[PDB]
């Protein structure tokens, strides 16, 4: 309901802000918060270090709504064709972000929620088995956090 939603929204705002302030001091609200923060930083670092190459590949992105799924799946399949590792996983997230930004740039905002769903499905079905076999997201935090 509207009343509860208002209450729930205020709570989430508080949690979000506190999580952020804690992270700035190297603390975390929760393990989930720690993972989110590690992934954000790793994505930033990835995109910063390899700025030339990342801009290059994203400049090759010429998506239309009718070709975006094929573009997403074909890149991601090739990315993981001969293995999964933490760096390729960071690359997978960064690629998804780039696609969302490009979609909004070109007034294709409708693609944003679709890309998120495609990424979540891929993560669930194709990355999670490796992730669980390799120490889970807690292990990623230990390495890239």
């Amino acid at each position: 309901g509207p009343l509860g939603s208002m209450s729930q929204s205020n709570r989430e705002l508080v949690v979000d802000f506190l999580s952020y302030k804690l992270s700035q001091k190297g603390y975390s609200w929760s393990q989930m918060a720690a993972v989110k923060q590690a992934l954000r930083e790793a994505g930033d670092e990835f995109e910063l270090r390899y700025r030339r190459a990342f801009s290059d590949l994203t400049s090759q992105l010429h998506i239309t709504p009718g070709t975006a799924y094929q573009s997403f799946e074909q890149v991601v399949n090739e990315l993981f064709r001969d293995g999964v590792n933490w760096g390729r996983i960071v690359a997978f997230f960064s690629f998804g972000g780039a696609l969302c930004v490009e979609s909004v740039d070109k007034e294709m905002q409708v693609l944003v929620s679709r890309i998120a769903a495609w990424m979540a499905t891929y993560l669930n079905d194709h990355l999670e088995p490796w992730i669980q076999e390799n120490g889970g997201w807690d292990t990623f935090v230990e390495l890239y956090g």
Binding site: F46, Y50, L57, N77, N85, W86, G87, I89, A91, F95
Partner: peptide, 18 residues
């Protein structure tokens, strides 16, 4: 092409940390 370049930098990033 995109995926090749993405894969290359992903592996570089991986090699550094993991």
């Amino acid at each position: 092409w995109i995926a090749q370049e993405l894969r290359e930098i992903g592996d570089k990033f991986n090699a550094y940390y993991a």
